[PDB]
Every structure is written in C-alpha cells, then in structure tokens.
Nucleic acid binder design. Sequence first.
RNA 1: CCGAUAGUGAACCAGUACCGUGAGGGAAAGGUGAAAAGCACCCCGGAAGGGGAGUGAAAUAGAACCUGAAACCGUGUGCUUACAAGUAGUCAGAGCCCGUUAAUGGGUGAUGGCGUGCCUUUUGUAGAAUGAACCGGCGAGUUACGAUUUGAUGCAAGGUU
RNA 2: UGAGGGUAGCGGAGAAAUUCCAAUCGAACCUGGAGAUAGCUGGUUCUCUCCGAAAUAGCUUUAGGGCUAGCCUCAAGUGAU
RNA 3: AUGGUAGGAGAGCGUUCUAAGGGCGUUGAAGCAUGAUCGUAAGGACAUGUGGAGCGCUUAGAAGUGAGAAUGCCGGUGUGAGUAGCGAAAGACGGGUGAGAAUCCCGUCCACCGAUUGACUAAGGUUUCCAGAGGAAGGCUCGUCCGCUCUGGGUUAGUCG
Lengths: 110, 43, 103, 48
Amino acid sequence: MEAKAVARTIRIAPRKVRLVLDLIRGKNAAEAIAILKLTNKASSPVIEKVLMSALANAEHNYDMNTDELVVKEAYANEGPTLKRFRPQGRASAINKRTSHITIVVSDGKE
Amino acid sequence: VKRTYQPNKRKHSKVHGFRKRMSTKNGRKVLARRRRKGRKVLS
Amino acid sequence: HIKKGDNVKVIAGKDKGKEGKVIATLPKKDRVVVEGVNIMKKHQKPTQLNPEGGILETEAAIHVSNVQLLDPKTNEPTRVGYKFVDGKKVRIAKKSGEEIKSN
Amino acid sequence: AVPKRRTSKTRKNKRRTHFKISVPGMTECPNCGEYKLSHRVCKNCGSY
RNA sequence: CCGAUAGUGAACCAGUACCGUGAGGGAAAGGUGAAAAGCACCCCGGAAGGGGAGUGAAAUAGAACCUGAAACCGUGUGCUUACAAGUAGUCAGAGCCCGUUAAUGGGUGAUGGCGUGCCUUUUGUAGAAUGAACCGGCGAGUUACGAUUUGAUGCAAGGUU
RNA sequence: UGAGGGUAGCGGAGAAAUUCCAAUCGAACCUGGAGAUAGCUGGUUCUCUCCGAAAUAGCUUUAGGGCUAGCCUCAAGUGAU
RNA sequence: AUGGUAGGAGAGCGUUCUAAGGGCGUUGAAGCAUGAUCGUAAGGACAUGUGGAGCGCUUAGAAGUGAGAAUGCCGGUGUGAGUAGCGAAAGACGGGUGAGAAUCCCGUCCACCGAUUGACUAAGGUUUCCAGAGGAAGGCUCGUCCGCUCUGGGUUAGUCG
C-alpha cells in the first residue's frame, strides 16, 4: 500500500534538492519530518510540504494509519529550464533550473 | 563617455521623414523600395 | 437535407436504429441535434445564477449525414428530392410522393 | 584557466563523495511540541 | 509537382519580434475534432498533487488533444564486481541467471597474455602537425545542347522528317 | 561651451598625425554586377563488386601548376610474334 | 590457379510513381519507437508501445536520391562547478503585517552628502505618475513594491512656453 505526491516545476535547481532528499530516504515519516525541520536549507520547506501531502493522501484515500509509514522513495527529476540573459556581466546566459519532487510513502506490507 | 547617437526630434524629422524623402528623386526611390517590400514604416 | 421539425432515424453511431425529432440544426458545420440521441454528461461549474451544478445530461450535436428522413408512407429511411409545384419547391420522398413537414 | 579534457561522469561523481549534508542533532521535546535543535529552545516548539 | 529548411523570407503574430542614425538587414514559431464533452460534483496546500468523475470505441490521449518517437543527457533501484601504473579493448572463466520471429539458444558479470580515428596531410604522424559530444533540415553530378567511344531496328542499297 | 546651419568618398576636412568623417579609414557604409576570380587550403556520404595501376625524361609571360612520353586498367585484334 | 586510394564491364537494396500484378488492413491495419529471425550488404515478412487508419512484396522505370569531420549552419539540444562573481558608501533595536521578514511599513537612536547623492528649468524618454488587489515571469531576494492586471484614474491658461 503506497501513497505518493509530486510537486512539479519547483524553482530550485535539482542538485540542491537532492542533497536534503538524501537525508530522508528510507526513514520513518515522523523522524523524516524532524530531520526536515532541523536543516536550514532552502528546500527543506518545499520537501516538507510534499511529504505532508503524501501522508495526507495515505490517510484520506487509502485509510492507512500514519504512524507506521516509512519514506519508501524520494527523488527529484529535472523539469524544464528557463533561459535568462545576464545583463550584469557581459551578455552570457544563466539558466533557471527547476525540478519535480516525488515522494512515496508506504507501510511495508502487501 | 559621449556616444554616437545623441537624439534630437527636429533633426530626425528633418534629415529623414516624409517631406525630405519626397523632395529628391533618389528619396522617392527609397520610398518606392520600402512600399514594394511592404514595410510598415516608410519613414 | 433536413429541417427543424423533422422525424429522423439515425443510421450511424452509438445510437443506431433509434429515432427522434430534430431540435436544432447548426448548418454551417452540418450538425443537427436529435432528442434522446448522443447524450453528453457535462461537468458544469457553479454559476452566478445556478446552484453548484449538475452532471448535465443533454444531447450533443450529431453530424447531419448520420440521419435519414422517414418515408411517411412506409417508415423507411429515404433520400429526398425536389418537386417544383407552382414556383414553390417541395421535398419529395424518393420512394413515394410528398413528405409534409412544418413541425 | 582552462581544462584540456572534459571530465567524465565517473570523475565528477568521485569528486562529489564528500560533498553532502550531515545529519542534525535532535534533543527531543519532552514537555510539548515538535523536536527542537540540540541545546536550543528553538523557535518552533521549543521546550528544552 | 512544393509537400511546408516548400514553389515562399513568411500557408502561425511576417517584411512582423528584433537589429541599425540612415540606406538597409531580417527570424523563431505551423498543425483535436469522434464529439469540450476542457476533470460539475466531491473530498487534503497558493502553485502542484492524490482520489474518484467524463463526454472518455482508448487521458503515461489534461491544454505539449498535430498525436509523438529517438539520442544526448538522466536520476532512484538493484545482479555481479575493490594491492594498484591504465588505445580500456581483445584472447585464455567463479558467481548469478534462464529459452524468441527457437536451438553447440540465451546469457550476465570476475581473471594471465597481447595491445595506436571519421580522419587529413605526408618520404615519413597515433600529436608535442591539423580538425572534431548528440540529433537533423542537413550538408558536395542537369541540360540548352554538342562531340566522341561501348544494345535493338525502320532496316540495310541504303538516311528522313 | 549650447542651439540652428554647411562641406560627402575618383570626395571632404586637417596649427600635418596617413589624422578624422557614427566603437570602421593607405580610401566609409549599404545594395547590386555576383554562384567575381582563387594554378591555394579544407571537405566530398546509403552499396557492397570481384579482380587489377602505380608514380621520370622533355618543353614551359610561366614553371608545390600544366602538357606529351614512361609506368597504366579495360576491350578488341594479329599471333609466335 | 585467384591484393591495388586510379581502372573496366558487376548483382543489390531506403523515396516516388507508374506500369502493372498480387497482398496486409475498421472482428483492426499499419508505419514509427522498444523483439531472438534474415545480412558483406545497403534493405524487408511473426511478442511492448503506438494508435485507431496506413503500409509491404514482385517485376521494371525515375531520382530534391543517398550521411562521423568541412575553426561546417542550426530548427537546435544538452554537457564540462556548487566553482568565479553578485557593480563603490553604516547601520542597530523595538513594534506591526503576514502562509512565511537581514529584505516591506511605523518608531527611536546612529550615520552619510552638504558649490551637493539638495532645489529648479532645457533636451531627450513617452504613462514610468496616483490608488486598489493577485503578482505564474520581471528584480544579481521576497511581495508581504512598482516600472504585469483593473481601471479609480490622472494633465484645466486672454497674461507661462
């Protein structure tokens, strides 16, 4: 039994979001939330909102108890990048990269 | 530093612009070329 | 070539063999609409002069070539022609004589 | 300033093995609230 | 016959964005309909999701309904694999598998020997000679019309168009 | 030092430097002749054939280029050559 | 008895049509992209995806025919680093507002320019001016401002120019 959520086109570059995504992988949902609360990184609040969305999915739509759930998968894919011309330097380009954050949570049973 | 192109409205209407181009024959040829190309602004 | 008050049989589509009355015509894209035929289920939002909204089971338009007039004499689908009676043009039924419609 | 050869995938990822985040502290909230930073009355639910 | 790097620069917002003081230069981007029927309705965070729902003959067919592919790149799983000096392959084999459009089939990944490009240009190069990731419009042999040399014939005392 | 004027490229302007004429100047910029010409450099691919040629004298308003001979492939022929 | 960047006469395939014949196809037919077959080829007949209405085979003819480089062009795509840099100057605390404040607003203190980083008038620019409210982008943050949206807008001369 697995619930998931994705957040699409989040405006943080994927290298910066995979760093904190490596912390919560394979842990329990409660201690995952605690790890996300005690890291000062720009993407801990985004990821925490996706994780709370997936736990809400599991409780509401599949009637899983939210105290047994572990974070089964957590990953970040590249979304579409936006190209900006930096005027501040000399006419060289800057891409705003964006990402897709997927979290899936489960009770380990079948 | 001071640049090329220091704008001026009267000068711009006086060296280019419709009545100056219609006043010579080569100027009328630029307006005929620009019509024939279908330009939105002739001058 | 059919009109607003007619009684038709549908000859192609999910409703097939069904009959009905045409109720609007939309001729510039050739789509009549027949009652009881090709029912959609529209997801209609809450409007300013409405409740929250229904599944709105109404008829959708059908292409005009999937529909054939019923011969008034034999109730078979038939094509139509035009007879010229006294400067007026009437539809005839191509297996019999006239078919009369005003509604 | 320039690289002569492009670096491969394997050399890039061998360089990134120390480039990661350490796990935080977590002295737990015994009175009330969420788990707070170690030796903190942290600003979100601190009951140290 | 153009079949849309197209008879067109432009079958879409085109001599338009934009660039240039001006003469002038000059793009990209095309693509339901089965029918919007375009996620009423309803439930958790703004965006975005998860559910149901649907005209849905089929939404990983959700505004990227011309669908729609590839490769580069990814990224998260795992099976096997960790005393060294390397044109990374090739020829000599423990663990793990298991077979289609079918029969020394199909394999996968560990060891001792041996080891220099489309390439180009050169007497000679593999660079300490040149030039270079992936994809592609997409990128290098007609006739006006002649000459000369290599199949079939009116058809051979013969040649007409 | 401001405003408004003027002088234009086979030309102008120059207390003269080959200096300046829109970030350009031993002769600006744009379009056209124009696919200029390039005895030089680089490129030249989906086939796979099979088998088979290799590479110097002589002349040169022009000599790291060219032409004819040599060394050639392929096809006929004569046929002891 | 049977090699050659230059050589002759060879059998073949991708696109198109004739000019045909014969097929696979709306109980599905593709093609195309992922599959064990054919192979020196180039090029085609049976498991996923696709759709959801388009292709092959045979023989012959015609070539926008004919796809690793040209410091090739680009619809173009994407890499190679958490690196360089973030463009002169003094801020601190309290309150407030908020989903969220080194950033926004109010306060107090401190500081800087002071022949000016002050106040007017030209040229030039053309709605940036003023209120509300969300800012999906914009700003080398956030919005919780304007230089996006709506209008609510807003420019008044006998004497100024």
